[PDB]
Design a protein around this ligand. Structure first.
Ligand SMILES: CC(C)(COP(=O)(O)O)[C@@H](O)C(=O)NCCC(=O)NCCS
Ligand SMILES: CC(C)(COP(=O)(O)O)[C@@H](O)C(=O)NCCC(=O)NCCS
Ligand SMILES: CC(C)(COP(=O)(O)O)[C@@H](O)C(=O)NCCC(=O)NCCS
Ligand SMILES: CC(C)(COP(=O)(O)O)[C@@H](O)C(=O)NCCC(=O)NCCS
Ligand SMILES: CC(C)(COP(=O)(O)O)[C@@H](O)C(=O)NCCC(=O)NCCS
Ligand SMILES: CC(C)(COP(=O)(O)O)[C@@H](O)C(=O)NCCC(=O)NCCS
Lengths: 155, 155, 155, 155, 155, 155
């Protein structure tokens, strides 16, 4: 089974990486789909961070996409969408998108994986807010992201 | 009983229409109140969509309003506000507005109606996002809205 | 419009009474349906409490019922079910019953009314627990209920 | 991938069957695990209902189990647990079990699938309550379950 | 114990004041931290409102801050953060910040206090929206805020 | 400040202990109140587990109580109730009790502390269920509890 893990990943956090690692162990192939269209990092920068952070996972690929997610899924020939859930995640929103995507692409399923408990409260938005003020986010994001934040924010 | 169903309806979805149809069957009179003040459709366009989509309901009228909803309710002489609820709807926000409106207009009640299960995950925001990228939203919105989206987005 | 407000009301609390009073002001007729089948009070005792507590509302009647609520609704010729909502109420459960009842009795709607903010945290279960240990529940329940609790618990 | 779908299924509803059908299409093998230990139906009766209702799915097997679910998963050599989610489901409880099971069986993942919107409000408990009073549950459960309910309740 | 109650307080509502009053009675010292960085009121105006509204509480001080809240907490030598909770409050968001702050400032706890039931549905955003259209918010905010709103909105 | 941490603690889990440890560091005195009245462990056994597990905390005492919690609080002369919150905890129920207790004991506050993220999904009920079937709960409960479970369940 080939699954697609979509998101803006601005930037990639340990929560995202944890879900990617779990999907990597479960499925034959995982494609991380990076949304491209105000993000802190460009689509290219976000993709580069992901390629560096997932280099150790042999069955994980990554690419940017524009337009409808279901069209990307069809384009890469995947069987399902995978998303991570956190005790904090917007349950309603994920359910809504999952149902809508299953209508746009008749029968396309979204499978939810539970992110590691230790990263239950990590979000890209909070990482950026903390980093912006010089806060230490080293335990919340992978090394590739930490380096990118320091370069971007000039810290 | 005369009830008012308020909203921005940008644009009207099948979820909204379903609630309007239920209110039409329950109450003697229903007035759909269209908020006017960045919306995709102008207040006039949103009102026109509603008039076309509800033409089959003899006791349903529609009008735009600015300012406080409670002042519009008093203006048209309605007895209550009616709102639709979805297993996804922002329960907290609706409860908050209902309580505040009951204070602004002493004793003015808001009655909640459950939208059809089949439209539980439809929202104007998602309809616009999907339509913007050429996605098929024909099963999510009434014909009047579908026509308006194609003309607006030039599709 | 004739509406039915169902419940076990074991015993009737100020939250229940508040909703009954709001329904009384909104609708032409309100019938409080008392479920009869381990309750602290018998169906007869629960009905008596309700008749005493709602005596001041001219358009409110009360009766016990067994079996399906929808059959009682049809029996008394009501147009809808009314239920109260609290920021604490089991939103999911009420939504579930509302949808199921709308299927059992094709098109039968349930209208939700918001209970007074001051009684947002009152429930029959907590009233009984507090009263059982001699706690003062006088501000949480109507006089009829207070008298019944003192007699039942021998306080 | 071989997945296990656990539950008490007392009795199997259309919500359960829908999830089983989705899992059947996604995974190579699906084993429905029936909990055996006050249920309305015996473990044998519940298993029989499932075997009849899933007969059309070639890659779906079913069996009863006692003790820890993770031990059953290991016993049948499955790679993950699959559970269905409904906009009403006890999100917290499912998350809790998923995390605990991932600890008991190091790394064992639970994948969540979204049940069909039309069965979002169906639960075994409500089916039994409605059927007990002669209510029509034919649209809420599969034929095998309908027959079992009529025989059990003598209707 | 010295606690810090942070927020934007744009403007201070009765919900905020209620929590401040409760914290004042519980702890030896309370410092209200006003976030400074599009707010309706300037940081100076927001601080002035708070100083006027809390003048009756002898152990309550107030100051503006920029950057990380944890740095302000350390700066004033406080032992914990205190936040108010409402049956409507974004539980998830408060939990997220509490956990993140406990990581940034190793072991720094956030203590949650329940706001008065009567102000359970009051928020700065809704106060501003209502006041903007000439609605009466006198029962939702303290006198200092009412005066500031009339001057700011020229009402 | 002297605070009371109430519960049935049947048995004490790492989630409970974590909250007790946090309260111990924050407040001058902490009294763990053990509810006594079908529990797996007797009130005496539950209290013994707590005394052993909290022996390292010099300002923590423990005692059993019957009747109303507010009466126990008054009896020991405490200033507030402290409770732990988990992203899974029944938010509504805790809010309800906090409000009711603040009415029974005019002004008695309940302060909520966030349990460690790592124990976010641990509950006494699940510990007992897992232990009953021979599951390893050593990482979910303190040594005192592990020993008590083995003796009670004869494992
Ligand atoms: C990128 C994402 C998966 C959400 O990512 P996020 O959780 O990082 O904000 C979603 O916005 C998306 O799928 N966008 C592509 C447009 C689309 O397909 N929209 C219809 C969704 S039903
Ligand atoms: C239009 C609406 C009903 C919300 O509509 P929405 O759900 O489509 O966003 C609400 O914004 C409104 O009532 N606006 C008028 C201003 C007002 O009365 N505000 C006070 C609300 S308590
Ligand atoms: C009595 C009540 C309204 C719930 O009352 P409660 O909130 O006081 O517990 C509900 O149990 C009911 O309607 N019972 C009658 C049986 C029935 O119709 N069941 C199907 C519900 S979909
Ligand atoms: C049967 C079920 C999946 C829950 O089923 P339900 O949703 O039908 O009530 C759960 O109770 C279970 O896994 N029971 C076996 C005992 C066990 O493994 N318990 C630990 C759960 S973390
Ligand atoms: C001001 C506030 C407490 C939130 O206030 P609000 O609820 O009024 O919007 C929060 O934004 C904050 O602490 N800001 C300072 C920046 C910071 O410390 N961010 C990290 C939060 S984990
Ligand atoms: C023991 C407890 C704190 C709840 O404990 P739990 O979360 O372990 O189930 C609660 O049941 C309690 O306070 N019981 C004493 C009786 C009482 O005071 N009841 C009124 C509560 S408002």
């Amino acid at each position: 089974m080939h699954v697609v893990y979509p998101g803006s990943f601005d930037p990639l956090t340990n929560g995202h990486l944890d879900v990617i690692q779990r999907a990597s162990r479960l499925f034959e192939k995982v494609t991380v789909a990076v949304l491209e269209n105000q993000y802190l990092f460009s689509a290219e920068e976000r993709l580069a961070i992901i390629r560096e952070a997932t280099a150790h996972l042999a069955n994980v690929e990554a690419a940017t996409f524009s337009g409808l997610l279901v069209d990307f899924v069809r384009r890469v020939g995947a069987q399902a969408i995978v998303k991570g859930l956190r005790a904090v995640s917007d349950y309603e929103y994920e359910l809504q998108m999952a149902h809508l995507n299953r209508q746009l692409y008749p029968g396309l399923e979204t499978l939810f994986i539970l992110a590691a408990t230790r990263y239950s409260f990590v979000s890209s938005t909070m990482v950026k807010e903390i980093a912006r003020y010089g806060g230490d986010v080293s335990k919340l994001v992978p090394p590739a992201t930490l380096r990118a934040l320091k370069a971007k924010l000039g810290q």
